[PDB]
Amino acid sequence: LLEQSGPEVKKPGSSVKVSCKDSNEPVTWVRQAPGQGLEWIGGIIPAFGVTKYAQKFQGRVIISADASTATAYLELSSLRSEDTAVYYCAKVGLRGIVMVGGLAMNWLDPWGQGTQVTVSSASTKGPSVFPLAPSGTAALGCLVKDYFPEPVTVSWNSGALTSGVHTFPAVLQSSGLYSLSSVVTVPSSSLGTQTYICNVNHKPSNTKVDKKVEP
């Protein structure tokens, strides 16, 4: 098991340091931008401190390891918004490891759970929550608009209403703020008799909103 440190939010030009805690093998770092594939960053042989870095990151990346705490580190500097990604650590298999000088390559296993790093000029902001009012099934919802950073959580009727709920992935607007909607379909006959409340939580702003949605 590889335990990684928590999510980070950073401004352009700054640097981020992420840790990977082993619960012997080289440790590699890979990242995945939103909706993209996997990109190798570099790696280290922790007992001996030998590092190798991908050419794209050489000059602004340092990987280090503390053998006494079985922890590896990734420090990436000169951050830009295109460095927004989930950062993974993973161990390089020892058996049949492929050596090219100080470079050690193999299949990767186990993997850390990933660290979300968001790079943005935006400031922390809580969402506004607006009703999407229902006009034999009806749809209704809540628009959760203009927040930073991710994530927001949405439930309906304090979690008692789950059937037919769709909470959409957030979209990043040109303003740098996120927006999403959550919708639910219900019998049109229940519109007069049943209350529908969307529960929105955005921890970075301690936003807690219960918005009743009605026709």
């Binding site: 993209q36 594939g37 996997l38 990109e39 190798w40 991908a54 050419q55 993974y88 993973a90 298999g93 049949g96 492929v98 090219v100 470079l103 390559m105 193999n106 299949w107 990767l108 296993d109 993997w111 850390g112 759970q113 990933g114 506004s128 607006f130 009703p131 999407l132 009012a133 006009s135 099934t137 749809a139 919802g141 628009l143 608009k145 769709h166 909470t167 959409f168 992935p169 957030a170 979209v171 607007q173 927006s179 999403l180 909607s181 919708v183 379909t185």
Partner: protein, 212 residues
């Protein structure tokens, strides 16, 4: 740099069908030093196959890999629900190691037309000076769909954004939202707001509209 091209980008198959995924290398891969990984949303990749054909420990027997040189394949003998995911190949025989861009194995189910709903901006939002109009396409399959906004029968461009869910856990459909953002002042300059939806399950495009 050995470039790895995976095909197809998306593979739509029914549960129980056989799945064959391709990884094609621009240069011959040194000595079958190729691995396959599975990834599900929110989770880390998981090693399935290494050395082109060796099964990682604890991976089900219905996964097998073969190939050499420039052409490799991952086979899932019969797809189970837990197997719908993104799959990546990796070569680690030449420096630098490289990854394919992924193949999504998607659940094929019967075609379902979207149910379409339109939502005007709330009075609460208008109080703050902006107006968002939301068009919902609910519970459709397959994923391909087109949404167009018309404001007084005039096609809009550049002022809307779309979001799509992952395939629903229970029924394997998609839902999609399109949100049109206008200034409050622009919103009041027009009367009729409409979204028009095209999908292969619809005999003809569906319009939902309201009059401000």
């Amino acid at each position: 740099e050995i470039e790895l091209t995976q095909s197809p980008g998306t593979l739509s198959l029914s549960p129980g069908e056989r799945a064959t995924l391709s990884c094609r290398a621009s240069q011959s891969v040194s000595s079958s030093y190729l691995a396959w990984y599975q990834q599900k949303p929110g989770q880390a990749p998981r090693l399935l196959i290494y050395g082109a054909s060796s099964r990682a420990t604890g991976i089900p027997d219905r996964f097998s890999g073969s190939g050499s040189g420039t052409d490799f394949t991952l086979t899932i003998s019969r797809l189970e629900p837990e197997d719908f995911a993104v799959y990546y190949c990796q070569q680690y025989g030449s420096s630098p190691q490289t990854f394919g861009q992924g193949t999504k194995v998607e659940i094929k189910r019967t075609v379902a037309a979207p149910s379409v709903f339109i939502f005007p901006p709330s009075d609460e939002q208008l109080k703050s000076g902006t107006a968002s109009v939301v068009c919902l396409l609910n519970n459709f399959y397959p994923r391909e769909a087109k949404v167009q906004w018309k404001v007084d029968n005039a096609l809009q461009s550049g002022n809307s954004q779309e979001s799509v869910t992952e395939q629903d856990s229970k029924d394997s459909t998609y839902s999609l939202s399109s949100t049109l953002t206008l200034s409050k002042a622009d919103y009041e300059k027009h009367k009729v707001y409409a979204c028009e939806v095209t999908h292969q399950g619809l005999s003809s495009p569906v319009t939902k509209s309201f009059n401000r």
